[PDB]
Subunit: 257 residues, 4 copies
């Protein structure tokens, strides 16, 4: 309850799923948390539920929303120590020829540029606090995924951008790290599975993609984020995998001709 | 002179630098090459110089330019076997707070979406020929670079997109690979060094970043591309490093406090 | 003080350096710790200093020493939850032609087989407790190091072995992870620097190999180990980098000929 | 037929499987090849079959066999340009508790120390010729494999050792690279499958582990080796994957509890 006491954290997309788990983990560590989300429903309830968390409506694709997010965080709490860029989206499965440049641009706006924009506006305050940035990327940025060319590209960009910024901000004492989750059971996962011909089979396949035989939880991503913020002072530019071992070994991906 | 005989290759940004080296390597392997560039000067001269190479003016950020590139390749040569997405740019060094979202969007248009667009328009023909895609990414997509947040992000995206598309196109027999060059001596490298306070010192530093003690040549990237196209039939989704060992070992990147 | 309460941890090479930092981190988390070392001096003093830590003399290259370590841990504390395979050595810098097969075999005995042996003897008890294995590998297993062929090979083996065992033990609920430290200021680092022509310059170079501009501390490796043991329940087979960013960007490792 | 003309290559374990494919690829490139194997049957026939290849009986675990291999290569051909350390073995599947330290030591002797020993004895001649080293590692050194702790550890060591030696030999102009094959259809693969309850199902699973839906061929590893030797002059310390994409995407490796 004291690992991150006295600290102020902003979590984007904090109203449900992984983001809500991260919010909860930081509140439990003693921090004050600003929940950012484009939708009011989940985050407003989370603000009522958690002493030490407040909700600010903010679409991270809208630069003036993000400017107000940062200025309101400072006005209300007087410092900023950690930014968790969690807001993002995975479209339904799309064959490459079914994608469009414009859809790709829109997904880049959320998954990549929204992270870039908040980080930029927050860095002056993070320098004052020797704070840190945590980006929520994805395992599939590293290893690929089927029927997800735009999504995979955005997460490859987030992971690489994390390393670049880590280099640039290291002289100023600001660490920049990312978490690459694998299959985490969230409302996004449940929504995507419901789109498939056999949602139960899709979910079972999702569980069995991990050697641990289950999907991960938001709380587990949250514990990884609290570690990076509060106890990883010699870590910068790392990609912390929270995947249950999905990247390990051979599996079903499809004699020598 | 016969490793890729009878094959048709498109090389974007083929008018100078790495792209020209790739053009030359494919012509020497027996292929017919379409040189795509937004600038006429280098590519037009290369077309006169090399029997088996022709030049098509095409800005890969303009979808109708790229549509015409593909349709003219098929009209003139009757097949398409390999697309080398080499066109790209590295801006001058920029501190993160000196970057802009709009500049980031523009660099994404060239380095990422231009590759995406040509690949998309070319894939129907590559499926017919069991052809392949070669994307020119960068080592710094994997390991980061200082004062280059947007550039690094675009190349992280290219490398990840390569793996995603490799997965999607594997059922159709189309391989998708990338090359990640390190410091290659090109007109871009020379132009960027000339911007620095001490260009000669910047170049010397660039050479010494490699254990091999020199920068690479376009011809060396070209040989890697010809290998991927012509002789790497069990390789898909790989990142072939052409870096002189820059990613190896400890160096100068800046007792326990 | 309660994150790992009620748990029993064995730390090999726990008498000084990183191992002692790991011991301290686990005691501070509420665990009981068995300090294993081949030398009595540091570990015996640590046992007197820390309530909740005890010292067992044990050379991890001697299978009967390790058998007794495990049986005495169970006899004295009634369970085993985590094994931290930290014992290891870095020889003085050695040109490849100055190495020998026999010296390589001896270093494999310590850095690789000692880890293998304790893990094997401990796994039956870790299965009962749904415990976990933490191996201390090295960044240079991943990226290489100059004048250290045998050492680098042993750490490449530890990192790979971690992933293999993670796969094998995942059905039994036992997680297997590693930490790859970079330059950590320890008595080993101080001893090796003292061998060099200019020890102060060697140390300064060591600090500047990290973007953060300093070396790491044992306490920082220790916090990473406590995270892996106590809060990383969806992590198995990962390599957690504790390197200060040394693997990021271009540096000094040595125009195109 | 001229890419590696006038060059002399040693291939260990060259009598069958991948090694024989590598032998054939180098002969077809114009090189003279010394086939090293501990068994006479395959390599002696290959020597009769291929003008430009000769067979030398040599067990790479026996240092005096390897000394004679190098001295006989120089005596008979007057130079040495490339060493391909292909000899190695994969034991039958073994649960971790079914392995032994002594079995692990023996596998290290072949898969790791045999490579080390030939490389050491060959490096003085490779320096004279600005030659290169190609080690045959494995994809599972990078990503792990089930029921293969010792094997995986040996290949993690080979890949890491490749990078270390690349660093050490770069000042002398000697490049050191590795190839990490995935599932390649060889007599070893056929022998291991025959041990399983349902060999045909094991083989079908092996094919489907690759997005390309087949296993690789020795000839494909061979083409990768010829590229590294003859045309990859700016590549050192790389791991060239010849895996058919097995490392890409999610598969079958085994809702959030
Ligand atoms: N669930 C997984 O398996 C998984 C795996 C890897 C990575 N991820 C990443 O984790 C993050 C969270 O994923 P999730 O599964 O919890 O998703 P989710 O859809 O359950 O929750 C995402 C939250 O972000 C909010 N959000 C979306 N667009 C926003 C915007 N423009 N501005 C502000 N908030 C916005 C949503 O309203 C929602 O509350 C994303 O970056 C996703 O790419 C998820
Ligand atoms: N030079 C290096 O050290 C280096 C290192 C890693 C990666 N790369 C990558 O290699 C590729 C080539 O780099 P280079 O150094 O040869 O650069 P360069 O600037 O010397 O040549 C690039 C060529 O692409 C053309 N081009 C630019 N924008 C274009 C567009 N919109 N449409 C069509 N053609 C366009 C240019 O006119 C030029 O002919 C780029 O993707 C770059 O990111 C270069
Ligand atoms: N210090 C660094 O920069 C660094 C970097 C990366 C990895 N590592 C790894 O971290 C680990 C600890 O390194 P360190 O710097 O603290 O070293 P250290 O030499 O300071 O401490 C090592 C401890 O292990 C003990 N030990 C050695 N051989 C043993 C054996 N046979 N049985 C039992 N105990 C034995 C020693 O007595 C000593 O107490 C090693 O695995 C090392 O390879 C260290
Ligand atoms: N087949 C695969 O799927 C695969 C995958 C990844 C890596 N590999 C690696 O490729 C290499 C070749 O594998 P393969 O499948 O062709 O095996 P193989 O068993 O078919 O052929 C290996 C050859 O090496 C020889 N050899 C074995 N021990 C030797 C020794 N002590 N001295 C000299 N020669 C010796 C054998 O006699 C045989 O001719 C090995 O290093 C293996 O680990 C194979
Ligand atoms: N085809 C398909 C499919 C079906 C259901 C899914 C459910 C969830 C996800 C998803 O959002 C996801 C899954 C894994 C990731 F690493 C990641 O970043 C995102 N992907 C799915 C992909
Ligand atoms: N600061 C700086 C700086 C100075 C000169 C440079 C000259 C060239 C490059 C460059 O374009 C480059 C360098 C290395 C790369 F891997 C890459 O993709 C691009 N980067 C430079 C970066
Ligand atoms: N040459 C050299 C040199 C000089 C001093 C050193 C001091 C410490 C170390 C060392 O033990 C080390 C350094 C970094 C590592 F990642 C690692 O696993 C071990 N390596 C050194 C290497
Ligand atoms: N269980 C099991 C199993 C069954 C049949 C196999 C047949 C071949 C191999 C094998 O030798 C191998 C397979 C893949 C590799 F990357 C590698 O280095 C080696 N592994 C197998 C593993
Ligand atoms: O909808 C799937 C899951 O989403 C998670 O974010 C919630 O914490 C769970 O209660 C829910 O089961
Ligand atoms: O301008 C730097 C270099 O660019 C390369 O692309 C050209 O092939 C070289 O002739 C030139 O030295
Ligand atoms: O000897 C170098 C360092 O070793 C560390 O393990 C100790 O905790 C420090 O007190 C000491 O400065
Ligand atoms: O035994 C499996 C395969 O081994 C390969 O090395 C041979 O070239 C093939 O002819 C054979 O089918
Ligand atoms: Na509240
Ligand atoms: Na022409
Ligand atoms: Na005590
Ligand atoms: Na012959």
């Amino acid at each position: 309850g004291t690992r991150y006491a006295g600290k102020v954290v902003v979590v984007t997309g904090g109203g449900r799923g992984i983001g809500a788990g991260i919010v909860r983990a930081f509140v439990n560590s003693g921090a004050r948390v600003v929940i950012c989300d484009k939708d009011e429903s989940g985050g407003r309830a989370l603000e009522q539920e958690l002493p030490g968390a407040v909700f600010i409506l903010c679409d991270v694709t809208q630069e003036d929303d993000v400017k107000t997010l940062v200025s309101e965080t400072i006005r209300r709490f007087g410092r900023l120590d950690c930014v968790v860029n969690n807001a993002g989206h995975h479209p339904p499965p799309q064959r490459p020829e079914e994608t469009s440049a414009q859809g790709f641009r829109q997904l880049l706006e959320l998954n990549l540029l929204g992270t870039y924009t908040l980080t930029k506006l927050a860095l002056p305050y993070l320098r004052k606090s020797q704070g840190n940035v945590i980006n929520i990327s994805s395992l599939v940025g590293a290893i690929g995924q089927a029927q997800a060319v735009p999504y995979v590209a955005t997460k490859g960009a987030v992971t690489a951008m994390t390393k670049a910024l880590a280099l640039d901000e290291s002289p100023y004492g600001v660490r920049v790290n990312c978490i690459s989750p694998g299959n985490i059971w969230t409302p996004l996962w449940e929504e995507l599975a419901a789109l498939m011909p056999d949602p139960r089979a899709t979910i079972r396949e999702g569980m069995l993609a991990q050697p641990l035989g289950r999907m991960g939880q938001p709380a587990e991503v949250g514990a990884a984020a609290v570690f990076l913020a509060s106890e990883a002072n010699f870590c910068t530019g790392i990609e912390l995998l929270v995947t249950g071992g999905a990247e390990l070994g051979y599996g079903c991906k499809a004699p020598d001709i």
